Design a protein around this ligand. Structure first.
Ligand SMILES: OC[C@H]1O[C@H](O[C@H]2[C@H](O)[C@@H](O)[C@@H](O[C@H]3[C@H](O)[C@@H](O)[C@@H](O[C@H]4[C@H](O)[C@@H](O)[C@@H](O[C@H]5[C@H](O)[C@@H](O)[C@@H](O[C@H]6[C@H](O)[C@@H](O)[C@@H](O[C@H]7[C@H](O)[C@@H](O)[C@H](O)O[C@@H]7CO)O[C@@H]6CO)O[C@@H]5CO)O[C@@H]4CO)O[C@@H]3CO)O[C@@H]2CO)[C@H](O)[C@@H](O)[C@@H]1O
Ligand SMILES: [Ca+2]
Ligand SMILES: [Ca+2]
Length: 508
């Protein structure tokens, strides 16, 4: 539908919706697996030191879990096709509005181009290249890779800035200048990876612009991931770009539902939902980001039995956990960090910190960072699907990005790192910053937010022996894998359909 049938406003809104909702066609793929969020999240989380997918029988899960996928990877095709599809939609909107000079359309085009740029970043970060097309048409996309792609995204962002909303002036959910600046800061931070030439001075500069804007850090970390993060100034003042989610109106199995339902199982107190999928749990390496010595991690003694009765309600579960100091609040206290939103209690069965074999959901601690509970205690909209928004872009990213840029430039990054540690009410403060502390802090601050893999690759820790974590590369204590795994392969299906695309080095 074009011309007189083109619903500009409607298509504009759908532009943003692709970030958090699945439409309504790949073979053997549940609709709930096609989302922009879920596919990119898995590609940047499942293979990392942050988490594990409990149901390994699911297609392509073992491959992603241990960094052993191939060009026939179903989950690689999923994110590749999803990213490409969203872009064709943006190109369509831009083509249909081309030539329109009214203030309204200009702003919409700026934001759409912002959204397209973000998508091209994922292509660049995940594949080092992307099936490029500036317009909507029949023509096969051409290949745009590395430096040229990097330069295109940067140029897009630089060109559309002037037309975007001032920081915190756009309707909640839409991207403003600070979102623009944050994306560029991320690009610059990883410029070394994408172009072979680092540019930390620029990453620092754009990070400072974001930090110097109206955005501010939420005083209660957990609130950023709660049901009312779209009706709480404390959380909203930090969320530069949210992915709206609603228990009744905006549902997505791969949306906040994925982060809440996917990390819970029946028996856990305060599930915030009626459905616990028991899918995502933390690896020992994740827990170690909060407990350098895993022996300090509050755990139930192995010689203590868990009653088969009397543990049916949250009240009973909590009381039992308190007796053994294993309530999440007890986990946070022992961790001396508000971000230690983990659970080792008996709700759902005995938990392990590390496992000799990936058997089930309880082989690692549970992650209760995402919640379908409002900080003000008010009712949520639905008993199953969460109202919780996904704060894709948070101000915290600017502090860690500037901190990393300063450190790599030979300066003192303690100031920026302690800004986040202070917010999380950390008992331990950083006296000096090391590469190790930085990558560890990136995990403590952003675990389960869909970016882990990218930070690891930048630190040369994703495939190498520089950092081995439980189950990395398929080995209990971790093992390395080929360096070509730092980039996902181009789906064989697209290699076959578009001769313009060349496979990434290393893959067959
Ligand atoms: O008919 C269309 C429908 O088909 C499928 O759903 C039906 C099943 O095919 C059918 O067999 C029956 O499922 C029951 C099983 O038969 C029964 O054995 C038991 O299943 C076990 C399962 O065997 C275990 O592996 C374990 O399951 C895990 C999964 O392995 C995890 O991946 C996770 O799951 C979640 C998905 O990952 C999410 O994407 C989402 O799934 C939704 C799809 O994304 C969406 O497109 C679709 O429309 O709805 C899906 C949900 O209904 O949520 C999933 C969790 O709900 O977590 C589960 C749970 O740990 O444990 C289960 C439970 O013991 O029980 C099964 C359910 O009763 O009935 C199914 C319909 O309810 C497709 O899966 C579905 O997408 C199609 O629409
Ligand atoms: Ca409300
Ligand atoms: Ca919401």
């Amino acid at each position: 539908q074009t011309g007189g049938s083109f619903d500009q406003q409607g298509v504009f809104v759908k532009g943003y919706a692709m970030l958090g909702v699945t439409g309504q066609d790949l073979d053997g793929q549940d609709e709930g697996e096609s989302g922009f969020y879920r596919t990119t999240f898995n590609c940047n989380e499942l293979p990392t030191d942050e988490c594990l997918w409990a149901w390994q029988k699911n297609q392509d899960i073992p491959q992603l879990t241990s960094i052993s996928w191939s060009p026939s990877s179903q989950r690689t095709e999923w994110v590749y096709v999803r990213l490409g599809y969203d872009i064709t939609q943006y190109n369509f909107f831009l083509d249909q509005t081309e030539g329109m000079t009214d203030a309204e359309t200009l702003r919409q085009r700026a934001e759409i181009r912002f959204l397209r740029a973000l998508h091209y970043w994922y292509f660049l970060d995940l594949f080092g290249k992307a099936p490029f097309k500036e317009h909507f048409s029949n023509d096969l996309p051409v290949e745009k890779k590395g430096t040229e792609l990097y330069t295109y995204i940067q140029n897009e962002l630089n060109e559309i800035e002037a037309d975007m909303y001032e920081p915190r002036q756009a309707p909640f959910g839409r991207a403003d200048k600070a979102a623009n600046w944050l994306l560029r800061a991320r690009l610059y931070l990883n410029a070394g990876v994408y172009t072979g030439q680092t540019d930390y001075a620029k990453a620092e500069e754009y990070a400072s612009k974001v930090i110097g804007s109206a955005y501010k850090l939420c005083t209660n970390y957990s609130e950023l991931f709660m049901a009312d993060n779209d009706e709480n100034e404390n959380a909203m003042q930090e969320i530069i770009l949210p992915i709206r989610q609603d228990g009744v109106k905006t549902r997505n199995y791969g949306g906040s539902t994925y982060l809440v339902c996917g990390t819970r199982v029946a028996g856990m107190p305060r599930m915030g939902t009626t459905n616990g999928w028991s899918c995502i749990f933390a690896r020992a390496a994740m827990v170690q980001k909060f407990f350098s010595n895993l022996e300090d991690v509050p755990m139930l003694p192995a010689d203590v039995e868990i009653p088969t009765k009397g543990l049916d309600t949250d009240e009973q579960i909590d009381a039992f956990d308190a007796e053994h100091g294993i309530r999440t609040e007890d986990m946070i206290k022992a961790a001396g960090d508000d971000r230690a939103l983990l659970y080792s209690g008996v709700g759902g069965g005995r938990r392990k910190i590390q496992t000799d074999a990936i058997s089930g959901f309880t082989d690692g601690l549970s992650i209760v960072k995402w919640q379908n509970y409002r900080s003000d205690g008010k009712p949520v909209s639905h008993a199953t699907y969460p109202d919780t928004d996904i704060p894709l872009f948070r101000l915290a990213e600017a502090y860690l990005t500037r901190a990393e840029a300063i450190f790599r430039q030979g300066g003192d990054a303690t100031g920026d790192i302690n800004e986040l540690r202070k917010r999380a009410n950390c008992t331990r403060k950083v006296q000096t910053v090391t590469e190790q502390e930085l990558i560890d802090e990136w995990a403590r601050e952003f675990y389960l937010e869909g970016r882990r893999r990218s930070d690891l690759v930048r630190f040369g820790m994703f495939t190498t022996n520089k950092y081995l974590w439980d189950w990395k590369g398929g080995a209990m204590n971790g093992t390395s894998v080929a360096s070509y795994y730092n980039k996902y392969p181009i789906p064989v299906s697209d290699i076959n359909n578009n001769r313009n695309m060349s496979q990434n080095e290393g893959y067959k």
